[PDB]
Design a protein around this ligand. Structure first.
Ligand SMILES: CCCCCC/C=C\CCCCCCCCCC(=O)O[C@H](COC(=O)CCCCCCCCCCCCCCC)COP(=O)(O)OC[C@@H](O)CO
Ligand SMILES: CCCCCC/C=C\CCCCCCCCCC(=O)O[C@H](COC(=O)CCCCCCCCCCCCCCC)COP(=O)(O)OC[C@@H](O)CO
Ligand SMILES: CCCCCCCCCCCCCCCCCC(=O)O[C@@H](COC(=O)CCCCCCCCCCCCCCC)COP(=O)(O)OCCN
Ligand SMILES: CCCCCCCCCCCCCCCCCC(=O)O[C@@H](COC(=O)CCCCCCCCCCCCCCC)COP(=O)(O)OCCN
Ligand SMILES: CCCCCCCCCCCCCCCCCC(=O)O[C@@H](COC(=O)CCCCCCCCCCCCCCC)COP(=O)(O)OCCN
Ligand SMILES: CCCCCCCCCCCCCCCCCC(=O)O[C@@H](COC(=O)CCCCCCCCCCCCCCC)COP(=O)(O)OCCN
Ligand code: HEM
Ligand code: HEM
Ligand code: HEM
Ligand SMILES: CCCCCCCCCCCCO[C@@H]1O[C@H](CO)[C@@H](O[C@H]2O[C@H](CO)[C@@H](O)[C@H](O)[C@H]2O)[C@H](O)[C@H]1O
Ligand SMILES: CCCCCCCCCCCCO[C@@H]1O[C@H](CO)[C@@H](O[C@H]2O[C@H](CO)[C@@H](O)[C@H](O)[C@H]2O)[C@H](O)[C@H]1O
Ligand SMILES: CCCCCCCCCCCCO[C@@H]1O[C@H](CO)[C@@H](O[C@H]2O[C@H](CO)[C@@H](O)[C@H](O)[C@H]2O)[C@H](O)[C@H]1O
Ligand SMILES: CCCCCCCCCCCCO[C@@H]1O[C@H](CO)[C@@H](O[C@H]2O[C@H](CO)[C@@H](O)[C@H](O)[C@H]2O)[C@H](O)[C@H]1O
Ligand code: SF4
Ligand code: SF4
Ligand code: F3S
Ligand code: F3S
Ligand code: FES
Lengths: 239, 520, 257, 239, 127
């Protein structure tokens, strides 16, 4: 009687919401890795890409209009994603608490045969949340991880995104944090790119292997690019 | 009766195929519910308008045939006479109700499906236009009335707010399964019914009739109600009504479940009367609901007149002395769909098509009779309205030939009916013109036929010296108040023949034999 | 109650009508509106005047004969009821009530308040049915109809054919009636085989009979005695779009006999 | 048997044609208000938008090619819309001629309950037709409502659309005509945005309120923007 | 929701052989609960999905399927089961080899029911 908003009523509907938001977030992650691949072209190309993100369709759309629409869509997707993930994590925790040997163990010898997707997904999701916060504070705003006099904020229509990236991955702690988050995001994609198709019902025996391979390809590409960026910056390949 | 019960299944199949929105279960299949007093759940229903959906399916089939050109529909056209040529019903004489035009139609067969005559009692549950003009004209033309005194009533009907009202809205008779019938003990009580204490409430049907507790048959309970209202109680706007109280049921059962059982009924009662039955007792009063009588028909649904077939409530047919619930719809659909198409074909195959046109002398005589009757009705210009005469006739028939009948009362009614008919034909006011939309003329014709039919009704009630079904004689009843049949002398169908004298019709007995269901 | 009535009085279709004023000294609040009209008719007959003519058979809000535009609203001020179901307790002492017939080109006025509503019959004749003959029906339980679909088809099928939707529609359109029948037949599996033809034919008939178009105003649902929703009109619109996609052409319209 | 052209055969089909053309015209009206919102950004931004409308997709598309495609689509939509509106208006007028107390009155009393969406739609549609004609003659061609030497035509790739806007809403008669047309277009949108979903059957009990709210939002935004433009120009906020 | 005595003839509604085979694959569920036990979330998604797929694949379960799935899913939420992370351990340990395509079918049914605005009924309270 509420319509599509009846999805919030069931756990399966919450997983459908997470599947749609994860579709949006996987698209953004792939496009963001593709955009950040331009740092190897040079500071000019990377800064041109940064400036053109804001001028997306400028002759028709005002400055930062499409960028702000995308930012709002991303914020809504990530908020729905985290809300549904927290709800379902708490539901599964309650489902496990009553019958359990301990608060850290369920069975005496439980043997997993279909992977450890729950552990990796939940822990990596928490890590990705913290990393997104630290990332927006780090590269978008420059208020963390920067010595005084290294971050150049976008003034007017000239961008120093390349300089910010080069001076960002200098502290090995930040590089290690980015690398760990990229490992857990690689696991996140490796499971979720197939899991969103399975959660929406767009899966069967024939396409199961194809969707698993697509998830593997997406996760591998994103992982390789997103660990190439900070390692190249820290080791001196991008300067 | 066996033919009706046998073709009921085809009736339901046809109705489902036509798209009648019967109640369904969650699995997609049909849902059955039980009537009052029935031991099986054999009834298929729409929510509360099953008759509406059945007639809508039949009307959609009729519209399909009208579009196909096989059926010519003449709405707002009232058949005023039957033309019998060479002994066969070979046409009808009708009047257009808008232009007033008298038309003559000739046919190889004539079917009368004009419903019952329950409006001979002025106060009834039937539609305002329901009449007996067609069947009375056929009876005067040669058709035999089979048991004209067989009338069914409804126990629960919303009473009238004054002498102006002539229609009692039919409420479901399951309302008596959860209510208590009473009137104030004092004849004149100005207190609110909910303010009247329990000791001062005359809980009749409970103080009297201890047997059949809270499930008294509709006839006994309604006779008690009419006797109570005739003694003078003043509970209703005119004193005609009894309190069906739901207060103790609401205290006992959950008001939510009582709502789930009677919500539509309570909403309709509050709309009609302006009183919520959740706080005040509801008022009910008996009204004549059905007529199991009508023109006598044989197994082929054909009347005494060859070529005249009577179907539905207009014939006597399958209901005997009491119509069961959901049987009038069943009988009508059976006759229309699965019986008459065979019997009318059987009749027509033995006769030559055509051969009779509307220029025959019989058509001219019938048309002249109709025109003279209409002109006479318009020319009386009396001081009394048509509804006044109809009200007098209905009150006399309800008091004398209603649920309680006796020889003295029936003789009094047989004396009074010719007097009312003469007063009608000398002192009635029918305004307007014939060639116009004169509704007063339609009412005048219907009441003119009713005044003749009521005499035959009273004569048949007087002749049947027994009680059976709806027909109740006070001289023949069990100590419990039930009907007491005389199967030795009255086990027959009484078909009455119009002899030209309204007070002396000829009785024809059609003997009844029961090889399968033994009378008990 | 003292009640003033401005009643439309028209001698016939050709004669132009006028509003006539009738004062009722005593009106019972429990008395129905049609009962008050009957009392006025008796008073007129006693005074020698011509009684007011109006359509009425059942007086239960089921048949659909009653058709009165009372004080600007079809079937009276109260919604979800008919003229016969309207009682004088809905009015106040000294009130002026304007009684009118349906005003539509496809609904000719025959008398004071009587209206010719055969255009609805011709709309039904143009495919508002299931073309099943007698004796050919399978078993009643052969085709399963879900309870929700049956409930919606009964909501649509509960249409008394009063024509108040045409009367209160500013365009004089039969959209609610046609939509109700189309939705009733379309929601059942028996109405599927000819549904996409039916709607087109029915819509064409409503165009041929002389009804207006649907501006989606919604007065039809507001004044409908049976509370038929605009979802029926949406269902008809979907059916007509799908039939246009299938290239469904309307048949020859039903000509009056 | 003629396919979708059968829509022309029925009044409901004409209403569906109007629903589709109104979808197109509502999209154009929203995009037009969004584009004209750049007057507050400045003359440079407004003239850049005007030039980029013609130079739309230029690396792949010729000059004014996409603009001419859009103009042809708009002309077809508005011609079908006006044709179907006239046909339906004449049909609904014929539906009331026979039974009516007067040529200006249907009933001696007709209390309406569901609104007045037949006076507003038709009268505002006639007003919008006249306004579109006058507006094309006014701002697109500058042949009406302009003192000599005040209107500058597109010269090659330079555009003086901002100057035309500033010198257009100087006569208060033009401002009043624009404001009245915007009021009736606000009514048009407030009804038709929901009515076009109802006409295509994309409506039910659950989404009726949602579509009503969407229509309200669209009408309010368009009305606010399209009355802000000429009021600001006339009062001196845009100069 | 079919009562006794109202059933039509057994051959009235044709069920394709592949649909019957899939519905028998789903219907072959012994209710052991090993899917809940091996699922790291303790979810009954395999059992509920098997029943939903069994009834949805037959023409007799069509009238009430989009309600049923929602209700069944809601009941699994009310009874205290976890959610499906699509791990697939339940199908690994299932004695009758119920595939994860049953869970995909349930997901499709629930999405379609949400598109229809299907509201779960009141949960079945333990007696
Ligand atoms: C996105 C496209 C999805 C379109 C199809 C929707 C789901 C669907 O129907 O297709 C699915 C496959 O989709 C898929 O892999 C679609 C994805 C293919 C690989 C990319 C699985 O369906 P089946 O088990 O073969 O039959 C299901 C039917 O009973 C429908 O209820
Ligand atoms: C884009 C078009 C989206 C709708 C596609 C058609 C879906 C549909 O079915 O149409 C309606 C669209 O709903 C709706 O408001 C959905 C339309 C969108 C409203 C949301 C706001 C945008 C809903 O119909 P129902 O009564 O639920 O079912 C209809 C069936 O009985 C026969 O079709
Ligand atoms: C998941 C998929 C993620 C995307 C995969 C990574 C993209 C593949 C290419 C790497 C990008 C850097 C390649 C450098 C480059 O552009 O050089 C040449 C490489 O061109 C190619 O032939 C390779 C690229 C073609 C395929 C592009 C695939 C794009 C996929 C986008 C997916 C994400 C969308 C959002 C083109 O010539 P140039 O003028 O740029 O030369 C250097 C400057 N003078
Ligand atoms: C639908 C209703 C129409 C759209 C309404 C909103 C559009 C106008 C928004 C205000 C524009 C003011 C000027 C631009 C501006 O300040 O936008 C800022 C933020 O504005 C937004 O985020 C607006 C988002 C609007 C989304 C686009 C709606 C499209 C509607 C369909 C066509 C970006 O800051 P900036 O300094 O980079 O801006 C350039 C000027 N220095
Ligand atoms: C359909 C909805 C459309 C959106 C409507 C709401 C959005 C617009 C209104 C609210 C925002 C206010 C816009 C006003 C313009 C702000 C931007 C601006 O002026 O540009 C500054 C750019 O500043 C920013 O950083 C702009 C804000 C963008 C950062 C926020 C990132 C959000 C991330 C979203 C995704 C979250 C993660 C989920 C996906 C993984 C310029 O910097 P500066 O030179 O003034 O620096 C300070 C002085 N040194
Ligand atoms: C899929 C179909 C594709 C389209 C096919 C047909 C259309 C193209 C062929 C017909 C038109 C060809 C015209 C080619 C030249 C037009 C450009 C041109 O001449 O540029 C001038 C600009 O010309 C125009 O302005 C031409 C008219 C364009 C405006 C037409 C308005 C159309 C409105 C349509 C929507 C109507 C309302 C419906 C929506 C609410 C530049 O200014 P000027 O040199 O004339 O300056 C004069 C100095 N004294
Ligand atoms: C970079 C942004 C993110 C992307 C691209 C992403 C992607 C995905 C995808 C595609 C799924 C599968 C959804 C499904 O099976 O229907 C998923 C599941 C999940 N994500 Fe995310 N996610 C992101 C951020 C997060 C964050 C920030 C959290 C934690 C707050 C999180 C926690 C989870 C959890 C717990 C699940 C699985 C829950 C379950 O399957 O029952 N994710 N993710
Ligand atoms: C090592 C790989 C990455 C690099 C080099 C990188 C680089 C950048 C840079 C330079 C910015 C600032 C540009 C801007 O704010 O508009 C940025 C912003 C952002 N990044 Fe990343 N990023 C990486 C990984 C990720 C990942 C994995 C995510 C998703 C979880 C992500 C999400 C974002 C978001 C949401 C913004 C803000 C976008 C905006 O403000 O418009 N980034 N990134
Ligand atoms: C670009 C400007 C216009 C827009 C955006 C617009 C939009 C709409 C929309 C969305 C509808 C509802 C259609 C439906 O319910 O299916 C509508 C109805 C209507 N429009 Fe327009 N319209 C515009 C201009 C006009 C014009 C120029 C006319 C005619 C001179 C007009 C006359 C009408 C009429 C008469 C109706 C409804 C008629 C009926 O339902 O009987 N409009 N409009
Ligand atoms: C920052 C982003 C948000 C951060 C986290 C805040 C959200 C907290 C989530 C935890 C509480 O979760 C909230 O309650 C329950 C979960 O039991 C859900 O509610 C639902 O739960 C399940 C279905 O999954 C059903 O059994 C239950 O009947 C229903 O109410 C709510 O829809 C969710 O909003
Ligand atoms: C801090 C948050 C970290 C992420 C969630 O943190 C944790 O997630 C795991 C999933 O691996 C769940 O805890 C886990 O414990 C048991 C222990 O045997 C696992 O078998 C099971 O898969 C899960 O219930 C809880 O929901 C939460 O305690
Ligand atoms: C600026 C250009 C637009 C304005 C100029 C065009 C205006 C012309 C329309 C005025 C009315 C004539 O419009 C014409 O209406 C008639 C009947 O109303 C429609 O006639 C047709 O459809 C109607 C139902 O809608 C039925 O009677 C029948 O199916 C057929 O006659 C025609 O298909 C349409 O062409
Ligand atoms: C050209 C000048 C403007 C034409 C505007 C529309 O034209 C006008 O529309 C109105 C409003 O629907 C219609 O007016 C007609 O229908 C309305 C209801 O809709 C009735 O209440 C009214 O009494 C009657 O005149 C007519 O068709 C026409 O008078
Ligand atoms: S749709 Fe409603 S208003 Fe119209 S005829 Fe049917 S019952 Fe009357
Ligand atoms: S493990 Fe398999 S057989 Fe056992 S309950 Fe779960 S689905 Fe059914
Ligand atoms: S009021 Fe009129 S516009 Fe359509 S919805 Fe009813 S017929
Ligand atoms: S193993 Fe568990 S996570 Fe879901 S797919 Fe099966 S219930
Ligand atoms: S008289 Fe039958 S509906 Fe009113």
């Amino acid at each position: 009687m509420t319509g599509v908003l009846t999805l919030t009523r069931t756990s399966v509907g919450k997983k459908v919401i997470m599947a749609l938001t994860g579709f949006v977030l996987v698209g953004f992650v792939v496009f963001h890795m593709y955009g950040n691949l331009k740092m190897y072209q040079g500071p000019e190309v990377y800064n041109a890409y940064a400036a053109g993100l804001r001028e997306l369709g400028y002759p028709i759309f005002g400055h930062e209009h499409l960028l702000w629409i995308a930012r709002f869509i991303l914020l809504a997707s990530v908020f729905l994603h985290i809300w549904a993930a927290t709800s379902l994590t708490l539901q599964s925790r309650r489902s496990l608490q009553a019958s359990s040997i301990s608060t850290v163990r369920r069975y005496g010898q439980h043997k997993r045969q279909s992977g450890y997707a729950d552990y990796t997904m939940r822990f990596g999701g928490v890590l990705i949340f913290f990393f997104i916060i630290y990332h927006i504070l780090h590269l978008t705003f420059g208020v963390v991880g920067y010595e005084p006099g290294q971050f150049i904020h976008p003034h007017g229509d000239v961008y120093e995104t390349y300089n910010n990236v080069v001076y960002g991955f200098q502290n090995p702690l930040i590089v290690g944090f980015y690398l760990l988050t990229m490992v857990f995001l690689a696991l996140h994609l490796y499971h979720g790119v197939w899991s969103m198709f399975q959660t929406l019902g767009w899966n069967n025996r024939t396409y199961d292997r194809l969707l698993r391979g697509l998830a593997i390809v997406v996760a591998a590409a994103v992982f390789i690019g997103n660990i190439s960026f900070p390692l190249a910056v820290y080791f001196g390949f991008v300067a | 009766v066996y033919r009706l019960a046998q073709v009921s299944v085809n009736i339901i199949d046809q109705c489902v195929a036509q798209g009648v929105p019967f109640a369904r279960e969650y699995g997609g299949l049909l849902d059955n519910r039980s009537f009052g007093g029935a031991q099986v759940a054999r009834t298929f229903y729409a929510r509360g308008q099953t008759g509406q959906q059945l007639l809508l399916g039949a009307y959609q089939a009729l519209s399909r045939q009208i579009a196909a050109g096989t059926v010519k529909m003449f709405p707002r056209t009232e058949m005023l006479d039957l033309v019998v040529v060479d002994g066969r019903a070979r046409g009808i004489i009708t009047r257009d109700m808008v232009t007033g035009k008298i038309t003559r139609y000739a046919a190889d067969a004539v079917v009368l499906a004009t419903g019952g005559y329950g409006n001979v009692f002025y106060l009834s549950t039937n539609a305002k236009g329901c009449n007996a003009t067609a069947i009375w004209r056929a009876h005067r033309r040669g058709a035999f009335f089979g048991n004209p005194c067989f009338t069914q009533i409804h126990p629960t009907c919303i009473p009238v707010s004054g002498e102006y009202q002539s229609k009692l809205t039919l409420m479901s008779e399951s309302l008596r399964n959860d209510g208590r019938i009473w009137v104030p003990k004092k004849k004149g009580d100005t207190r609110r019914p909910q303010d009247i204490p329990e000791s001062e409430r005359d809980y009749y049907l409970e103080e009297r009739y201890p047997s059949f507790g809270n499930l008294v048959p509709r006839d006994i309970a309604s006779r008690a109600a009419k006797q109570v209202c005739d003694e003078g109680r003043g509970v209703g706007p005119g004193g005609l009504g009894v309190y069906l109280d739901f207060a103790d049921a609401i205290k006992r059962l959950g008001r939510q479940k009582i709502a789930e059982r009677y919500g539509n009924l309570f909403d309709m009662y509050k709309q009609i009367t302006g009183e919520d039955p959740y706080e005040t007792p509801m008022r009910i009063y008996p009204a004549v609901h059905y007529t199991m009588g009508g023109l006598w028909v044989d197994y082929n649904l054909q009347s005494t007149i060859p070529g005249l077939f009577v179907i539905g409530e207009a014939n006597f047919s399958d209901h005997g002395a009491n119509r069961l619930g959901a049987s009038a719809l069943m009988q009508g659909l059976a006759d229309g769909y699965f019986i008459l198409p065979y019997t009318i074909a059987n009749f027509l195959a033995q006769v030559k098509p055509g051969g009779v046109s509307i220029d025959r002398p019989e058509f001219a005589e019938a048309e002249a009779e109709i025109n003279q009757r209409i002109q006479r009705l318009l020319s009386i210009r009396g001081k009394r309205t048509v509804d006044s005469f109809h009200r007098e006739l209905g009150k006399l028939m309800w008091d004398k030939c209603g649920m309680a009948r006796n020889a003295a009362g029936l003789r009094e009614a047989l004396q009074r009916i010719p007097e009312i008919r003469a007063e009608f034909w000398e002192n009635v006011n029918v305004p307007g013109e014939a060639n116009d939309l004169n509704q007063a003329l339609e009412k005048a014709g219907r009441v003119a036929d009713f005044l003749e039919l009521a005499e035959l009704m009273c004569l048949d009630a007087l002749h049947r010296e027994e009680s059976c079904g709806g027909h109740f004689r006070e001289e023949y009843q069990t100590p419990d108040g039930e009907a007491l049949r005389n199967d030795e002398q009255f086990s027959y169908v009484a078909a009455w023949e119009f002899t030209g004298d309204l007070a002396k019709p000829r009785l024809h007995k059609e003997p009844l034999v029961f090889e399968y269901v033994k009378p008990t | 109650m003292k009640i003033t009535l401005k009643i439309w009085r028209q001698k016939n279709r050709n004669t132009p009508g006028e509003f006539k004023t009738y004062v009722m000294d005593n009106v019972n609040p429990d008395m129905s509106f049609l009962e008050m009209l009957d009392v006025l008719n008796e008073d007129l007959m006693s005074r020698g005047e011509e009684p007011v003519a109006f359509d009425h058979d059942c007086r239960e809000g089921i048949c659909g004969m009653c058709s009165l535009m009372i004080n600007g609203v079809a079937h009276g001020p109260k919604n979800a009821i008919t003229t016969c179901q309207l009682h004088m307790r809905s009015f106040k002492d000294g009130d002026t009530i304007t009684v009118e017939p349906w005003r539509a080109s496809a609904f000719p006025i025959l008398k004071d308040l009587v209206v010719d509503r055969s255009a609805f019959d011709r709309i039904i004749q143009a495919g508002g049915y299931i073309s099943v003959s007698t004796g050919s029906a399978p078993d009643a339980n052969t085709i399963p109809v879900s309870k929700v679909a049956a409930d919606r088809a009964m909501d649509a099928a509960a249409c008394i054919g009063c024509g108040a939707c045409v009367a209160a529609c500013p365009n004089g359109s039969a959209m609610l009636f046609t939509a109700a029948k189309v939705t009733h037949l379309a929601l059942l599996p028996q109405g599927q085989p000819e549904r996409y033809q039916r709607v087109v034919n029915m819509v064409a008939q409503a165009d041929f009979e002389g009804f207006g178009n649907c501006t989606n105003i919604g007065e039809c649902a507001a004044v409908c005695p049976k509370e038929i929703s605009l979802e029926t009109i949406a269902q008809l619109n979907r059916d007509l779009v799908m039939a246009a996609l299938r290239g469904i052409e309307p048949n020859t319209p039903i000509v009056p006999a």
